[PDB]
Amino acid sequence: QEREVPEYLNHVSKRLEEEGDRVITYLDHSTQKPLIACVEKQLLGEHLTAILQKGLDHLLDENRVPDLAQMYQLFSRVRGGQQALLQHWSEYIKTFGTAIVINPEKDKDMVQDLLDFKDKVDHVIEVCFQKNERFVNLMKESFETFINKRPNKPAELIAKHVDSKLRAGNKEATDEELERTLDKIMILFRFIHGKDVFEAFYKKDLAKRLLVGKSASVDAEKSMLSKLKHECGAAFTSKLEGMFKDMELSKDIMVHFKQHMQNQSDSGPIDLTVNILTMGYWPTYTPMEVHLTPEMIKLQEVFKAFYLGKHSGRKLQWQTTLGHAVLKAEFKEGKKEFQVSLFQTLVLLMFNEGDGFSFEEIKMATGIEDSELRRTLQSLACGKARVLIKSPKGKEVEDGDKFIFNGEFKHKLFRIKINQIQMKETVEEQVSTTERVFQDRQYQIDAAIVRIMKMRKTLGHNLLVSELYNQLKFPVKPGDLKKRIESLIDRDYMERDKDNPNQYHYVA
């Protein structure tokens, strides 16, 4: 009640260490153990909360690994002080994890902080708790109890950060670290719940990663398929391996077509490339109304011709906007090459035939929807206008864009890769990619509950929730439980047993 909690802890440490040698020289061994028992009651006995809540969490936040190990000793010797240690420090885990994801204004940085708290608690176990396992039990319990509460802020932020770690830079060439931080991704986000939204978003992420730019590594994606195969269903990693098999099918079609133009001897500059896919293992894509230069339409018909062979049973529903393409660009003061997107490639295709178009037939002769075309003009316009030049300036954009293509263009590099768009995405794009999972759980829980009542006739709702939580990779809301109860009654697999929702039957 005079010194600080760490000061009193060091005093207790040294004062207990005093009482040994008293016996060692002169006092009695058989009263050494009564002496330490009494003294440890006098110092540490009956003070296992006012030392061990604040002065625990205070010196954990200060993270003095010497005194944390000291109190670990000083409360692993004592009568039961490690129980107070486990409870106070585990509540400390829950709250000091909870100081991340419940913050809706602070979603720009969540994943790195989660990695940080994971790292800190791991280090406090491995030295400050000296690889005891009770602490690990409280850790995992506390983490899962925490993240059952917010499922679909983290898994989406986590998916974006997983994709961010799946980028090809010049800074990283040791994928071993990215293997190790990938191991931390798997282990740490096994605490994070709602994995179906992460799963579908990772379909979106491999789409946005292959379709523009290039991945961090081949073995990185292979290791992720093998790792995410674990901890989820074995029919939950059928689509991803289907992605890479469909990519190999498209490459084999590429080899076949290149061999079939080996005797036609292409020397022309105009290229067509379609990597074709099936809708069972990929994100779904529906064509949107867009306008194509008629030679591209000729290439579409060529694509039909080479499409109709090789496992016929095939019928066109084409996409002609989702790729990125390399293009040479005429300007004054040099001819450099652009790596750009099809939304912008059509823009640049019209800025060959003339300079002087306006947003009316830029809206029309592209055909591009408003949501895509605004963000198309947020790249290389709304700033840095030396290729396209848009009459509204700044973040605010009005419907009056007047364009005259610029002769002037300056940069110090070749292969001018100015392409945010397809390695970016919009808010309602993310929201819609979430709703394609929201009322997609419907058939999942439908199948699960029809199988349950086909297995056990009576099951209260507080047990249906637990069987579903056992079975599924995401947490099911109480609203969705009412939703499936009512729809099962609509399709005659439930009857309310005893005229209340307490129990049910499988009678129609």
Binding site: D271, L277, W282, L322, T345
Partner: peptide, 21 residues
Amino acid sequence: KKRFEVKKWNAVALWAWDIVV
């Protein structure tokens, strides 16, 4: 020949079903 001379068009797309449900 043009202000962008066409060197590469590349696309990703889906091959679709053709059997009755």
